[PDB]
Amino acid sequence: KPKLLNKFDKTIKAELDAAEKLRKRGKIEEAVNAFKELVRKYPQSPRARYGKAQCEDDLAEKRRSNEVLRGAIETYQEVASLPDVPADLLKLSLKRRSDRQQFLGHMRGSLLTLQRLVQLFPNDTSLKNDLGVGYLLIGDNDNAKKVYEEVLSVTPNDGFAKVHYGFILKAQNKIAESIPYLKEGIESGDPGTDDGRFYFHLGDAMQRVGNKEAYKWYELGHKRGHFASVWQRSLYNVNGLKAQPWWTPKETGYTELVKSLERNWKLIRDEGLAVMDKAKGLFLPEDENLREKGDWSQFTLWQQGRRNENACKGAPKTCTLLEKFPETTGCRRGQIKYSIMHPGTHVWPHTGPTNCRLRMHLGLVIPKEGCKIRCANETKTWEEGKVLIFDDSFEHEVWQDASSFRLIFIVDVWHPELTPQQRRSLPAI
Template sequence: MHLKCLGFFWRGGGGVVSCKSDVQQKHKRGLGQEITFGNAFGLPCYCAVPSLLCIFNCSLHKYFLLSLSMKGTLGGVYDADGDGDFDVEDAKVLLVILHYCKSNAVVNSFTAKKKKPKLLNKFDKTIKSEINAAEKLRKKGKIEESLRAFEALVQKFPQSPRCRYGKAQAEDDLAEKKRSNEMLLKAVNSYREVAELPDVPPDLVKATLKRCADRQQFLGRTRGSLATLEKLVQIFPEDISLKNDLGVAHLLLGDNKGAKRIYEEVLARAPHDGFAKVHYGFILKSENMIAESIPYLREGLETGEPGTDDGRFYFHLGDALQRTGDKSAYDWYEAGHRRGHFASVWQRSLYNVPGLRARPWWTAEETGYTALVKMLERNWLTIRDEALSVLDSNSGQFLPEDENLRETGDWGQFTLWQQGRKVAASCRYVPKTCGLLERYTEATSCKRGQIKFSVMQAGTHVWPHTGPTNCRLRMHLGLVIPSKGCRIRCTNQTRSWEEGKVLIFDDSFEHEVWQEAESFRLIFIVDVWHPELTQLQRQTLSPI
């Protein structure tokens, strides 16, 4: 899935057949615990491209283009402005999408246990043996044979809903096997045809249209998926799970208001629905209604219902509690850690590589990047002077931080490299600085980081937050540092910058910044690959 988000505005892209979460714990205290997301094929659980701030484009015209891992695929979700920080605005996409996949799977399995769906009308019961024979081939993996059998049945019995449904399922399976979007389009059309036939059992209508909506979303046909779900809700107005799915579809389309309206309707009818509560709370938080979001997120998580147990809900609840001064935030972070969502209470990144050394603060020697550190410290005056010339020019190169990370103050950033790509237009303003960095590929090739200047005015406080991944370390070179009032906390250790000196920390751990001086603070941020990543990993990890 590939999305970029601002608040809850999205535009859909696509998805896959199933979702699965694998959690691997490496250390007793969780510092090495890694979380990866994907499915049996290593494909992304969903594709979407948020509407306002695209940072990751993907084409779904061919299945082989979906060979990204989900953790890489969803990397862009975290970083609305490309600075690698994970905040209220950034994580929403994953939240909704993962729960959409997971809740559907679980809810459907529960439904199956309670009541076996009735998929045959009276006529189809008379040809049940022929249907079963074709279905048996499909279940044995003989998909081509099954498809031929169902095609023959449809030709022989064109008004049979179950035969046409079997044909659609076989086309669906064959599309997955061949990674063919063309075949999947045939399946979507066949699913649609089933629902349009006369005398279709209600259970078959529901199963058909739900799968049709899912496959439409996979193909990036988000509006078509929304229309299909709206039809389902009209046919089955009492099915709350369908309303919840419709809310997700609105989010994927970028219709934040529509999603909010849907979840309000759900909660009016089912006030204890956990899925609706966490998503409604999530929307409120994206609207900066921090205090109002807390009870919905908390009560939704407490239900333990399918679709609620996800690290991003724990993250946002904890973040909201922190911003209101409620120390129970760390209880929820601890709960998220116990549930396997976070590496630890402090380290809450979600796009991780297993087994990497996890510690909040690093020395240059520990990173192995001493040459880079020495170069930065040796040339800090040159770097500072170029940055000040840009700052003094009022050229508009320093852009405001826009991820809602600040409680107070002004914070601007001027980016030179992002996701391992040089921003040539920016480097024209600071050619000496960019020239100094060119040969240090541990920084310039870091697809999960940035290189940028950061200016923070007096009176700025940055909320506690975490970066998205454990795959990088962050260097801060002090350029203009007031004598008092500027400090950074990472976990429970607080330090201050020095002019001409480099601080190194792992921003996947919680960190917080105070600028209480009387003048501005200017630093140079250089993200580098985690030193324990192999060359192959550095080449194949997708950007964040």
């Protein structure tokens, strides 16, 4: 189907096929040399150049080398620079260039490639969509939103554009607006629409508006393998980890950590209160659109397994106490933070991103009534000097209807069934 050979390349199709044949047989090593020989002999051959690139691409896979993949990325560029490049080959080469640029985290570089691809093929809808993903990956939702608006003005039925537009709308707290786009988008069945993200956020948007159809979409996302279960909807998981909403200290195995938190809870409280009184700016409002209403702020000591040096100068004793417990300080998919919530606060039902952590809550200042947390089908209360443990990858919900502030200390730990090597290798969240 795809025509990759220009006039001259057709005259050397035998040599080109011979070299490509070696690459398919996994003998990538002598295929590199075969294509490099063709590139020397025919320095303007787009197909020979593409072969060199693909081989460099496979060699990067084998050797796991960023440097050679960087080379492949340049060779894919080289293909586009040669004269008389067939349209199919030009598109393929630059698409792969972008893909690999994103893999390396050269998201800015990827963007320029995607912009070029759209400039070269102004009627290709899929490339406009890919450009939209490029903007999303760098955090540029404004430019992403424009791209999908542009796509949808020409192609209103494009499901990919709809789910992504819906995703952006929901991120912007345009809940009601987002639902039909997410729904129609997933329902389109277009490639790239069957993604856990869109099931996750469609049901959540529906929950927030009181649409009881929400769990029907959670059930479907589960059925399609996006969620471990209807209750546990995290999307960055290690499959198989013991899954339950509430944990006892003994069940976690982190009994020494719990002992330390509970024995020393007042020093932790006191440093938190001191920061509230003398440096309240260190508490940052919750910024993930999880509140229906009210005031909720957090003062973070560790995130992604990295100590915040300045923050720990505000709670030096607490940070010193925690240094002894790598199960939390080294939890690169969790945090250590104070969490203050005031009356008139309701946190929407929500889910954390990963099943690889468990979340400890130490009560520091807990009004006698008004404060509670639901995880799955069970609601519990905090106690001063006492640790609660739950898996926040399960849907949970929080209320604060007391007559004064509620302060807790949040300590995330690796899921105990995670091996030392998994703890070492899992990318940070």
